[PDB]
């Protein structure tokens with residue numbers, strides 16, 4: 001039965017955060033439902049939603065398209081991943097600011113088409129008249145972390161990346177209040193299905209276990 | 225003043241980064257270029273002079289290449305916290321305990337690869353898991369295991385990734401392992417590569433690993 005299927009797209013690195021918990025609870029509440037999961041970048045999720053290849057997309061930025069709509073789930077703090085012997089690691093307990101990083105070799109990611117996660121990272125530098133002088137782009141966050149640990153530079157990464165711990169890799173807090181990164185759930189620009197409204201309530205439940213406080217105008221409910 | 229090193233991505237969770245870092249610090253005049261690539265690509269790149277050393281998990285013999293086994297890394301089973309296999313002591317389980325589970329193999333790139341190696345270890349003992357799905361890379365398998373979708377066989381160094389309600393269970397079969405090799409051109413005798421060998425030896429000595437006679441020495 002094609003009607004009893006829900007297909008979900010997601011950026012791969014979100015598996016380091018709350019997404020697996022959400023999927024686990026969703027499956028527990030829906031043993032009847034065939035749930036299919038597809039890794040894809042935020043840009044690619046738009047075309048997949050428009051074409052009906054997926055029904056909801058977990059992404060890391062807003063890319064405006066009239067066929068799609070979205071809800072901001074939350075913002076994650078950014079950390080600076082450094083080698084433990086880097087001078088910046090002496091500020092591990094308290095943190096650093098974006099302006100401390102301008103002359104460092106920074107590893108951006110992913111390498112998938114623009115805009116992507118790295119676009120916002122470069123924007124927050126520009127927003128404050130900061131011009132990083134040494135940038136390299138790598139394939140994905142786990143490669144960036146391994147390179148940092150090998151001595152290749154530093155990288156700005158979501159806080160949930162701390163699920164990965166490597167010898168002599170250290171995560172330093174980034175103190176600028178706008179040094180954060182968004183998580184969105186995107187769907188077709190139409191009324192959500194029963195199954196998608198059910199996914200929204202699963203997210204609400206997981207976020208409540210995590211102690212987050214939701215605004216009034218957050219995830220929409222079904223109306224008459 | 226430039227050495228080029230190729231490596232399979234999974235090795236970033238183990239000792240390779242600290243090896244490269246110690247090597248880097250001992251050679252301030254040398255440029256280190258690191259390239260993520262599979263074993264097939266490493267072999268051809270070595271032959272053509274595009275990389276100088278390759279780190280991988282597969283040894284197919286080639287007359288133009290010399291490979292040295294660094295160590296055998298243990299395999300483990302990634303399972304969800306409440307899984308019955310996660311109830312079986314601080315001892316472990318055997319491969320034959322896994323045959324009726326949904327197993328997540330990876331990567332989905334061209335073979336030979338880690339999935340064919342895993343399936344070979346099963347077939348080596350007349351075990352034929354029927355509930356198999358192939359995914360892109362290790363993080364996808366782990367995330368799906370944490371989501372409750374199945375189990376996955378992974379290298380021990382994968383424990384660098386820790387996810388909510390994901391547990392790693394030891395395997396008891398002696399051949400439940402995955403090797404790590406360094407590959408160079410069979411001709412090779414560069415001082416920079418001999419020094420790379422020295423660095424591997426130092427770190428392994430500190431870990432207390434590999435002590436066969438003339439291992440990377442001459």
Ligand code: NA
Nearest residue numbers: 030031033034
């Ligand atoms: Na289900």
